[PDB]
Amino acid sequence: DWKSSLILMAYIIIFLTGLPANLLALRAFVGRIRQPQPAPVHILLLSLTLADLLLLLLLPFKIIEAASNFRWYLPKVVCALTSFGFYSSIYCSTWLLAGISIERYLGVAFPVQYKLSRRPLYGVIAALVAWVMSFGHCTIVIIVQYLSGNEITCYENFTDNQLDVVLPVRLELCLVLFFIPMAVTIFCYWRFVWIMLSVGAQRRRRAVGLAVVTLLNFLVCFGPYNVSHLVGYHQRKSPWWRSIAVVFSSLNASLDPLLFYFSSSVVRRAFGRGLQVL
Ligand SMILES: C[C@]1(C(=O)N(CCCC(=O)O)Cc2cccc(Cl)c2)CCN1C(=O)c1csc2ccccc12
């Protein structure tokens, strides 16, 4: 009861804290465009904002669930659409954050290439690759898993045979769409921070802060969910703390705003104006 209510209120907080800041971020980038940005970084970040918006706008469904002890029964189609809605955002975000890690390292360190390739169009493909990879692979999940008065919004008994097909797919996504980005993100930022270490204080604090946020996201926000998938092999059963792990997956949407503040000064100016009003 209260155990459920807490997640409801936490999700409301995430919604009511996130959505305004994310809309302000979206507007900030739309502002930062001025003449459509020449910078590949600013495009990739915009995609993350859209991926966040996609999640945050669909987030309220969860607060409604948490009230009703996951009772209200949704059609299998609706259940699938909402599930796909979530999956897309997370695994898109991971590759985008990896793309940012690439961008900062390759951009700042070894700047000769960045001086020549300061055109925006070379960047756009990375966002499209992230979207295509996310959508394309995530679709497989809902294909496989989809085509009574129990306390479950979507009870996932599946089938004993299907289990043997389903879990490998979840592990495949877990590995390729997270554990690989993880290996890239840390490899880039470890160097980027070293290069930055080797206005200056502001640049340093921005650069470190950026890396801290990206690291934190993978461990705190995305970690437990992707661990919970892997535990699937050990237990051969959906862990009870999946619903808890999901909280963290949503939490990212609250901390992603900071990324934009640390990255782009225009966002700091825009939030400055927003804070001036508020
Ligand atoms: C919550 C969950 C899901 O879809 N379930 C959970 C099974 C039941 C269990 O065991 O609690 C069914 C479900 C949950 C909710 C709505 C529908 Cl219509 C169907 C699992 C990750 N995920 C989403 O992809 C997700 C979908 S909307 C959304 C919003 C925010 C975060 C994540 C999500």
Author numbering: 4 to 150, 158 to 208, 318 to 397
Quoted from the paper:
The free fatty acid receptor 2 (FFA2) is a G protein-coupled receptor (GPCR) that selectively recognizes short-chain fatty acids to regulate metabolic and immune functions. In humans, there are four FFA receptors (FFA1-FFA4); FFA1 and FFA4 specifically recognize long-chain fatty acids (LCFAs) with aliphatic tails of more than 14 carbons, whereas FFA2 and FFA3 are responsive to short-chain fatty acids (SCFAs) with aliphatic tails of 2–6 carbons. Expressed across various cell types, including immune cells, adipose tissue, intestinal epithelial and endocrine cells, and pancreatic β-cells, FFA2 plays a crucial role in regulating immune function, lipid metabolism, and the secretion of glucagon-like peptide 1 (GLP-1) and insulin through the activation of the Gi or Gq pathways. Here, we determine the cryo-electron microscopic (cryo-EM) structures of the human FFA2–Gi signaling complex simultaneously bound to TUG-1375 and 4-CMTB, as well as inactive FFA2 bound to GLPG0974.
To facilitate the determination of the antagonist-bound FFA2 structure through cryo-EM analysis, we generated the chimeric FFA2-BRIL protein by inserting cytochrome b562 RIL (BRIL) into the intracellular loop 3 (ICL3) of FFA220. We then purified FFA2-BRIL in the presence of the antagonist GLPG0974 and coupled it with the anti-BRIL antibody BAG2. The resulting complex was further purified by gel-filtration chromatography, vitrified, imaged, and the structure was determined at a nominal resolution of 3.36 Å. GLPG0974 is accommodated within the extracellular binding site, but surprisingly, there is no overlap with the TUG-1375 binding site. While the binding site of TUG-1375 is mainly formed by TMs 3-5, the binding site of GLPG0974 is mainly formed by TMs 2, 3, and 7. Thus, we term this binding site of GLPG0974 as allosteric site 1. In allosteric site 1, GLPG0974 exhibits hydrophobic or van der Waals interactions with L612.56, L622.57, V813.24, C823.25, T853.28, S863.29, F893.32, T163ECL2, C164ECL2, E166ECL2, Y2386.51, R2557.35, and V2597.39, a cation-π interaction with K652.60 and an anion-π interaction with E682.63. Moreover, GLPG0974 binding induces a conformational change in Y903.33, the tyrosine residue dividing the two binding sites, causing it to be pushed towards the TUG-1375 binding site. However, in the GLPG0974-bound structure, due to the conformational change induced by GLPG0974, Y903.33 collapses the space for the binding of the carboxyl group of TUG-1375, presumably restricting the accessibility of both synthetic and endogenous agonists. The antagonist forms a cation-π interaction with K652.60, which prevents the formation of the cation-π interaction between K652.60 and F893.32 that stabilizes the active conformation.
